[PDB]
From Swiss-Prot:
UniProt: RNA binding residues: 46, 61, 103
Region (RNA-binding): 1-128
Superkingdom: Viruses
Family: Belongs to the betacoronavirus nucleocapsid protein family.
Chain's role: Packages the positive strand viral genome RNA into a helical ribonucleocapsid (RNP) and plays a fundamental role during virion assembly through its interactions with the viral genome and membrane protein M. Plays an important role in enhancing the efficiency of subgenomic viral RNA transcription as well as viral replication. Attenuates the stress granules formation by reducing host G3BP1 access to host mRNAs under stress conditions.
Taxonomic lineage of the native organism: Viruses, Riboviria, Orthornavirae, Pisuviricota, Pisoniviricetes
Location of this chain's protein in the cell: Virion; Host cytoplasm; Secreted; Host extracellular space
Chain ranges of the CoV N NTD domain: 2-128
Subunit structure: Homodimer, homotetramer, homooligomer with RNA. Both monomeric and oligomeric forms interact with RNA. Interacts with protein M. Interacts with protein E. Interacts with NSP3; this interaction serves to tether the genome to the newly translated replicase-transcriptase complex at a very early stage of infection. Interacts with host NLRP3 and ABHD8; these interactions disrupt the association between NLRP3 and ABHD8, increasing NLRP3 stability, ultimately leading to increased inflammasome activation.
Effect of residue 46 to E: Complete loss of RNA-binding
Segments for region (Disordered): 17-37
Protein name, per record: Nucleoprotein
Record PTM text: ADP-ribosylated. The ADP-ribosylation is retained in the virion during infection. Phosphorylated on serine residues by host GSK3A and GSK3B. This promotes the solubility of homodimers that would otherwise aggregate. Host phosphatase would dephosphorylate the protein during assembly at M bound membranes.
């Protein structure tokens, strides 16, 4: 039960949470169809031992999962929960993407996360 994202992460280097204007934010995936272009980003925090023994937060990562997949596969679109933000492309179907699912790193590399040109990223986000 791996549940790894199909895509590389967005790294939040600034102080604002991730969010996209309605219609934006779904990563480009040629292995998916217009109906599939909907899901959520989940914040993934990591803590590390700093240079003085005190544990400290690294920059949070935001991983995309298709609707109905991933660590929050049970949440319906729009559900409010800290660390979860929703995205959907024009024309997507509000149905679980059991037809896309999640990635097994043993037999599939992550897709480098790309957005169509001119997407409104928040301050501090550019990643990879």
């Amino acid at each position: 039960n791996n549940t790894a994202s199909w895509f590389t992460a967005l790294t939040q280097h600034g102080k604002e949470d991730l969010k996209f204007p309605r219609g934006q934010g779904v990563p480009i995936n040629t292995n998916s169809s217009p109906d599939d272009q909907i899901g959520y980003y989940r914040r993934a925090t990591r803590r590390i031992r700093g240079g003085d023994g005190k544990m400290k937060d690294l920059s949070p990562r935001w991983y995309f999962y298709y609707l109905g997949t991933g660590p929050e596969a049970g949440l319906p679109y729009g559900a409010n929960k800290d660390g979860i933000i929703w995205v959907a492309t024009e024309g997507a179907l509000n149905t679980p993407k059991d037809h896309i699912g999640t990635r097994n790193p043993a037999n599939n590399a992550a897709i480098v996360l790309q957005l169509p040109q001119g997407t409104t990223l928040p301050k501090g986000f550019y990643a990879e």
